[PDB]
Amino acid sequence: GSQASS
Amino acid sequence: GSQASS
Amino acid sequence: GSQASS
Amino acid sequence: GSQASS
Amino acid sequence: GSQASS
Amino acid sequence: GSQASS
Amino acid sequence: GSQASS
Amino acid sequence: GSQASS
Amino acid sequence: GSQASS
Amino acid sequence: GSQASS
Amino acid sequence: GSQASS
Amino acid sequence: GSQASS
Amino acid sequence: GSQASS
Amino acid sequence: GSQASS
Amino acid sequence: GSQASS
Amino acid sequence: GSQASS
Numbered sequence: 297g298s299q300a301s302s
Numbered sequence: 303g304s305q306a307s308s
Numbered sequence: 309g310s311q312a313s314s
Numbered sequence: 315g316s317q318a319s320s
Numbered sequence: 321g322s323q324a325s326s
Numbered sequence: 327g328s329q330a331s332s
Numbered sequence: 333g334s335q336a337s338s
Numbered sequence: 339g340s341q342a343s344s
Numbered sequence: 345g346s347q348a349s350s
Numbered sequence: 351g352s353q354a355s356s
Numbered sequence: 357g358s359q360a361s362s
Numbered sequence: 363g364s365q366a367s368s
Numbered sequence: 369g370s371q372a373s374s
Numbered sequence: 375g376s377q378a379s380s
Numbered sequence: 381g382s383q384a385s386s
Numbered sequence: 387g388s389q390a391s392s
Contacts (some may be wrong), residue, residue: 316336317335318334
């Protein structure tokens with residue numbers, strides 16, 4: 297699973 | 303699963 | 309599953 | 315399933 | 321704009 | 327803009 | 333912008 | 339911007 | 345910017 | 351699993 | 357910027 | 363697993 | 369910037 | 375596992 | 381900048 | 387495992 301926050 | 307927040 | 313928030 | 319919010 | 325495909 | 331594909 | 337693929 | 343792939 | 349691949 | 355925060 | 361690969 | 367914070 | 373590979 | 379903080 | 385490989 | 391802090 298991939299989580300990306302910006 | 304993929305989560306992307308911007 | 310994919311979640312995308314902007 | 316896909317969720318997209320903008 | 322939001323695009324969601326499943 | 328948000329794009330979500332699954 | 334957010335892109336999420338699964 | 340956030341990109342998440344799984 | 346955030347990129348996450350799995 | 352991959353987590354990326356910026 | 358953050359890049360995470362797994 | 364990979365974690366990247368910036 | 370942060371890069372993490374596993 | 376890889377952790378990278380900046 | 382931080383690079384972590386495993 | 388690899389940890390990198392900067």
